[PDB]
Write a protein that binds this ligand. Structure first.
Ligand SMILES: *O[C]([C]([O])[C]([O])[C]1[O@@]23[C](OP([O])([O])=O)C2456[C]O[O@]42O154OP326=O4)C(*)(*)(*)([C@@](*)(*)[O@](*)(*)P(*)(*)(*)(=O)(O*)O*)=[O@](*)(*)*
Ligand SMILES: *O[C]([C]([O])[C]([O])[C]1[O@@]23[C](OP([O])([O])=O)C2456[C]O[O@]42O154OP326=O4)C(*)(*)(*)([C@@](*)(*)[O@](*)(*)P(*)(*)(*)(=O)(O*)O*)=[O@](*)(*)*
Ligand SMILES: O=C(COP(=O)(O)O)[C@@H](O)[C@H](O)[C@H](O)COP(=O)(O)O
Ligand SMILES: O=C(COP(=O)(O)O)[C@@H](O)[C@H](O)[C@H](O)COP(=O)(O)O
Lengths: 363, 363, 363, 363
C-alpha cells in the first residue's frame, strides 16, 4: 500500500507552504463567499438591491482597503462570480488581493442533498468534475478550496449515516483538491439551531471530528496541507442557559485537543451567525485556554467581519471610507484575538489620579 | 429511527411492481446503453462511421423488431441520446418499446474518477443533480436506472477504500432513484482483466457483494425494489486455466447465495465481454446449479445480444431483416438459458434409425 | 487474501453435515442449557429445591423418553454440568442422546459485561480459552455450540457500539467453533422488554442481523456450517397493541429475507418467554408465510418446550410418565408447526382463555 | 448519547493525575512484566535456573536501589507473580516501590489467539473477568495496566480484520481499566520482524494508530487518563538499509503527530529488542525532533533497561552492587534522553563497535 503514494514531495511541499502562509503571524481568513442568494439577504437588510453590480461594488471596497490588511488577513474565500470580476479601474480582484500577499480561495461545494430515511439530514454535492474545476481554478490564481458539511443536533440527529457520509465526502473533496494543488479547508459544521446545551454540543462535535479525521486517514489525505474550519462549542440558539467566553473556550479546546491531529497547521473558526463582539471574545478566550494547543487557533469569519461594514455602506460609494474602516477594525481586533492579546474595553487598570488622562465623565 | 421511513407503502408498491415486471417469466434486459464513444468502437468493427444517424439507425432496427420480443425482453437500458430519438416514422423509441410492454431504463452514472493513493483504482461520478434528472427521466417514461461501479483484481486491489467508496456511492444512487420512482439496477462489476484464477475471483466477488448489501442497509434502500447486475464468477482473461460452464456456475451461485438477500427480486448478469455462446451456456448452467436460488437468475446483456446483429447489419437498411433475426435468436436463446431450458446442439438423443429424419451427412 | 483459507474442504463438509442434520425433516432443538441460577427459578415455582440432583432428575426424565422424539428433535443444547451427568443407571446423558441419534450441543458464552457510556447496554464474555474448550467438548461428543448476545430497545438503544461489539464478538466465537469442528449457533437476541410496537422491533432486528452477517463475512465464517437463532418480531411485553400470528409471521419473515443469506441452513427461533401455545402458533404461521424462505424455519425452545413437563413433574419421581408425555406433546406439535402442518382447533383474540399462560408476569 | 457518561468528574481527575504523575519531569517506566516463560529465556543465557526464587532475587535487586531512581522512573509494570512477592526481609515489593514514590502497574493481557483466514495474524485474550481483576489489583495498590497487541508486516499483513480486532479489543480493555480506576497503557505494537524498510513501517504505524484512536473514541475512552506505548518507526530486523537516530526520529514523530491526539499525556516507547544504546539514542533524537510534540515522549523499557544489570548479576548474590549501579546507569541516561539532554561521546555508522550489542540474534 505504501508503494502508491497519493502525493509527491513537491506536491506536499506546495500544500504545506500555502496552509502555513494563510495562518502565519496570527492572520485569519475573510469568508466573502456568500452566494448570490445569501448576498441578497445581506443587501436586503440595508435596503439595497441584489444585483451583480451592487455585490461587486461592496466586495470592491473590501479588497481595495489599505495594504495594511495583509497583517491581519492571510486569505480570502471567494464565490465563483467574484473570482472573475474587476474593480472600477479594470484590475481583477484576485490580482489586487495577490499584490498585497493575500491568498485567494474558492467555495467548492454545491449545497446539500437530502438523505432518505433520516430526520431531515443532508449530505453535500459537488464532487462531479471537481478535479477539472480545481485545475482550472488553480490556473486562475486560487490556492485553496472550502467545502461545508452540515450536521444537525436533534431527535435522531446526527445519525451515523449522516456522520459517515459527510465525513467521507469531505475526505473525497480534500483528496481531489490536493491532487490539483489546492489546500482544502475542511468545514464540518455542527449547526447551532436547537435548544441543546453546551455539553450536548461538545459531545457531538468530538464524535463528528473523530469520524472526520479517520475518514481523511482512510482517503490518504495529507494533513499538513489542510486547514480545519469547525464550529466553536456553544449551546444552541434557543437554549436558556447562558455561557461565558471562558466556558465556551474550555469546551472548544477540550473537544479539539481530543480529536484534531497536531499535523494540522491551523484551525479557523466559523462565525456561525455570531455577533462581531462574541466572535472576537470567544476566539480570544480560546487562545488563553491553558490546554494543549499544537496548532494555530484563528478565524475564518464572514458576517463577524462584515456586519458593521455593510451597515456603514448603505449602497453609497459616498460612504466608502467608513466601510473600509469598519472592516479594518474587525480584522485587526480578530488578529489580536487569535494571539490572545485582545484587551476588551481599552487597556487601563483602576485609577483616577493615575497621571495625565482625559478619559472621564462622558462628553 | 423507525419513525422516519425512507419510502411510503405506495412508493414501495410501485418499485416492486417494476422490478418484478422486468424479470417476469424468464425475461431479461437488453443493455443498449453504449455511449457515443463506445458505440463508435462497435460501428468501427463493421466499417461504419460513428454518427448520431448511424447509431440511431441500428437502435431503430432492434426496437422495431416483431412484438414477439416482449416474451424474452422485459426491459431495455438506453443511453440519454436514444431516449429522445425517433424511428423513420416519427415515433419515439421509448413509446415503441412501451407499446410492446417493455420497461425503459436509463444509464445514470458519469464514469469513473481516480482514487488517490491506490493502485489505479476508481470511484464513480454522477450524484450531483441525480434527483432532478431522475424526476425528469421519470416524466419522460423511464422506470429504472443503472449505475456501474468498477472493482479490479490486482496488486493491492481491490483495496478496502475502493470497496467502501463504490459500495456507498452505489447505495447513494440507489436511494435517490427510489425517491423518484426508478428501480435501481446495482452493478458492482469486478472486471475480468488479469491472470487470476476462478477461485481468486469468487473470493473477491463475495467480499464486494457483502460490502454492497451492508451499505444498502445503512442507506435504507428498499431491496424488493432493486435489481442486482453482478459479474459471473470466472477466471481472468489472461488465465491459462480453462473452466467449464458448470464450474463457473457453481462458483457464481456459491458467491451469490452467501451474500445477496432473498428480498432482491432478480439478478441479471452482465456479459462482460463474453462471446454470445458462453453468455448463454453459463447462464443456463447457473440455472441448473442445485444450490439455493431464491431469486431470478437472468441476463442484462449488451454485446452478447448484439454482436451478431451488428455483423448482419453492415450499415445497410438493406440487411434489416437479418439484423432483427440475429437479435431475436439471441433473445429467445438467453430467455431459455434463464429458465435452464437451453438445450445446446439441437434436441436429439443418440439414434440413426430413430424414425423419419433428414439430419445426417452434411449437404 | 484468498490464499489463507480458514477451513479445508474436509472441515467444511463436516460443518455442513452437522448443521443440515439438526434441522432436517422439520426437527428442532431443545434448549435445556439453563444455568443453575436460571434453573433454580424454574424449580422454585414448583416448590422443589435447586440442587444438582433435582436438576439432573428432571433432565433425566426428558432425555429418557421413547426413541420417537428423534423425529421431532434433532439437537439438544446442554449446560456444562449436564454434559457429564449420568442417569439412574450410571449411563452418560450425552450417550443416551447420541444413541437416539440426537446431536449434542453446548452453551459457550459466559454472561454479559457492561459497556460504559451506554444506557445499560452489554457485550458478552467467553472468548478466553474458548478454542481449547471447544476442542475438549468435541472429544466429549459435542457437535455444536450456543452464544447468546443481548440487544435491547430503549432510550439510545441499541447503539452502534452495542451492535458492532455483539456482532463482532459473535463472529469471533463462530470462527473459533468452526476451527474446532463445532457448528456455531449464532443468537443475536433483541429482548422483548419495553413498550415498543411490532414495527420498532422489525426495524431493529433487520439492523442487528445486517451487522451480524457483515461481521461473519469479515471474520471468514463458513455460513453453510452455521445456524441462526434470532428472536421473532413481536411487540414489546409492555405493548398494549395486539398482534396475530399472521402479522408476527409477516414482520419476521420480512426481516429475515432482507438480511439472512440463503447459505444459512436453518433459522431456529428462540421462544423468549412466550407461551407454549404462542411459540407453536407463531412458528406454524411463519412457515405458512408467502415470502421467499430459502432456509428451514424451525425452533430452539426452552420454556416453550418444557413448561408443561415441569408442571406435571412437581419434583415427584412418580410423575415420570405425565412429564414425558407432556414433553413429547410439545415436541411433536412444534415439529408440525415447523412444517406449517399445525392446526389449532380453537378461536380467540385477546380476551379469553388460555387460562394456561393467560399471561405470564414477564422477566 | 451525552446523558450516559462513562466516568464521573471525580473518576476522571484521578485518571488524569496518575497518568501525568508517571511521565512527569522526564521520568519513564520500567517494563519488568516478563512472564516466567519469557524470564526463563533471560536467565538461561546467564546460566541461571528459571525458578521463582531467581526471578524474585533479581527483581529484588532492582527494586531495592537508592531512593534517587524516583527521579528517573515514575512507574514499574509488574507481572502478577511479582505483585505479591517480598524481599529478603518479608516486605512486599509493591510497598517498597510505593515508598519510593513509584507508581505500580500490572500486565493484563493473556497472550495471543490466531485469527483464521489470515496469514498468521492474531488477536489478544484477557477480557474475561478483567473488571473484577482490575478491582482487586486496585485494592492491592496497582494504579495502571498494560495490554500488548501485536500487528505484523508481511504478505497480506496487517489486514483490516487484524487492525479492527486489535484496536477494538484494545479499546474494551481501556474502558474497563478506567471504570476500575486504573490508567490503561495502550500498546499497539508493529513488530520489527521482516525485511521491510523505514517507510513501510511508518505507513503501517500511522494506519494502526488511526484505527486505535478512532476505536478509543467509539468506546468512550477518556484519553486524558491513558498512556500510549507504541513501537518506534524503524526498518525491519532483516533490513539491510542503515538508518540514523535522526531519521528514525523523523519517521516516528511524523507518524505520531498525524495520529495521536494532544489529549494523551504521554507516549512511552517500547524498546523492541534493540540495544540499550539505540533505545537511548533514538529516544534522545525523538525529543530533539523539530516537529510539533504536545505529549511527553518517554520510555517504557524492558531489556534496554535491564540487559547490563542482568549480565553483571550472573546469579551471584555478591554482585548486587554492580547490578544496581548498571541499572541506575541506564535509568538516568534514558531520563536524560527523554529530555533530549543526552550527549553521547562517540562517532560511528554501521561498522564498528558497539561490541556490547554488536548485534543481537533477533527473536
Ligand atoms: O428465549 C430464548 C433466550 O434467548 C435464551 O436462549 C435463554 O437464555 C437466558 O437466560 P436469562 O435468565 O439470563 O434470561 C439465557 C442466556 O444466558 O442464556 O438463555 O441461552 P440462555 O439459557 C430461549 C430460552 O429462554 P426462554 O424464556 O424462551 O425459555 O430460547
Ligand atoms: O519491546 C517491548 C514489547 O512490545 C513488549 O512490551 C514485550 O512483551 C512480549 O514478550 P515476547 O517474548 O512474547 O515477545 C511481551 C508481551 O506479551 O508481553 O511483552 O509486554 P511483554 O512482556 C518492550 C519489552 O520487550 P523488549 O525486547 O524490548 O525488552 O518494551
Ligand atoms: O458561519 C459561517 C460563515 O460566516 P457567517 O457569515 O455565516 O456568519 C458558515 O456557517 C457558512 O459560511 C454560512 O453560514 C453558510 O453559507 P454557505 O457558505 O454554505 O453557502
Ligand atoms: O458487460 C457489460 C455490458 O455488456 P457488454 O457490451 O460490455 O459485453 C458491462 O461491463 C458494461 O456495460 C460495459 O462493458 C462498460 O461500459 P459502460 O456501460 O460503463 O459505459
Amino acid at each position: 500500500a505504501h508503494r502508491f503514494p497519493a502525493l509527491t514531495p513537491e506536491q506536499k511541499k506546495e500544500l504545506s507552504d500555502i496552509a502555513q502562509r494563510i495562518v502565519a503571524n496570527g492572520k485569519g481568513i475573510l469568508a466573502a463567499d456568500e452566494s448570490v442568494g445569501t448576498m441578497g439577504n445581506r443587501l436586503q437588510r440595508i435596503k439595497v438591491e441584489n444585483s451583480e453590480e451592487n455585490r461587486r461594488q461592496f466586495r470592491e471596497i473590501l479588497f481595495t482597503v489599505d495594504n495594511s490588511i495583509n497583517q491581519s488577513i492571510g486569505g480570502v474565500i471567494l464565490f465563483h462570480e467574484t473570482l472573475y470580476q474587476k474593480d472600477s479601474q479594470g484590475k481583477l480582484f484576485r490580482n489586487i488581493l495577490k499584490e498585497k500577499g493575500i491568498v485567494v480561495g474558492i467555495k467548492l461545494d454545491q449545497g446539500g442533498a437530502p438523505l432518505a430515511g433520516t430526520n431531515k439530514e443532508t449530505t453535500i454535492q459537488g464532487l462531479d468534475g471537481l478535479s477539472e474545476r480545481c485545475a482550472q481554478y488553480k490556473k486562475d490564481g486560487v490556492d485553496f478550496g472550502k467545502w461545508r458539511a452540515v450536521l444537525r443536533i436533534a431527535d435522531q440527529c446526527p445519525s451515523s449515516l449522516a456522520i459517515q457520509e459527510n465525513a467521507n465526502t469531505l475526505a473525497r473533496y480534500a483528496s481531489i483538491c490536493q491532487q490539483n494543488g489546492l489546500v482544502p479547508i475542511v468545514e464540518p459544521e455542527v449547526i447551532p439551531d436547537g435548544d441543546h446545551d453546551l455539553e450536548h454540543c461538545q459531545y457531538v462535535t468530538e464524535k463528528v471530528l473523530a469520524a472526520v479525521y479517520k475518514a481523511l486517514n482512510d482517503h490518504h489525505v495529507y494533513l499538513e496541507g489542510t486547514l480545519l474550519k469547525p464550529n466553536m462549542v456553544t449551546a444552541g440558539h434557543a437554549c436558556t442557559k447562558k455561557y461565558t467566553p471562558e466556558q465556551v473556550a474550555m469546551a472548544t479546546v477540550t473537544a479539539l485537543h481530543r480529536t484534531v491531529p497536531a499535523a494540522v497547521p491551523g484551525i479557523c473558526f466559523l462565525s456561525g451567525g455570531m455577533s462581531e463582539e462574541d466572535a472576537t471574545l470567544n476566539l480570544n478566550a480560546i487562545n488563553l485556554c491553558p490546554l494543549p494547543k499544537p496548532w494555530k487557533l484563528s478565524f475564518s469569519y464572514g458576517r463577524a467581519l462584515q456586519a458593521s461594514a455593510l451597515a456603514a455602506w448603505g449602497g453609497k460609494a459616498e460612504n466608502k471610507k467608513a466601510t473600509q474602516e469598519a472592516f479594518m477594525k474587525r480584522a485587526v481586533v480578530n488578529c489580536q484575538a487569535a494571539k490572545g492579546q485582545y484587551v476588551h474595553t481599552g487597556s487601563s487598570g483602576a485609577a483616577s489620579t493615575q497621571s495625565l488622562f482625559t478619559a472621564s465623565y462622558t462628553y
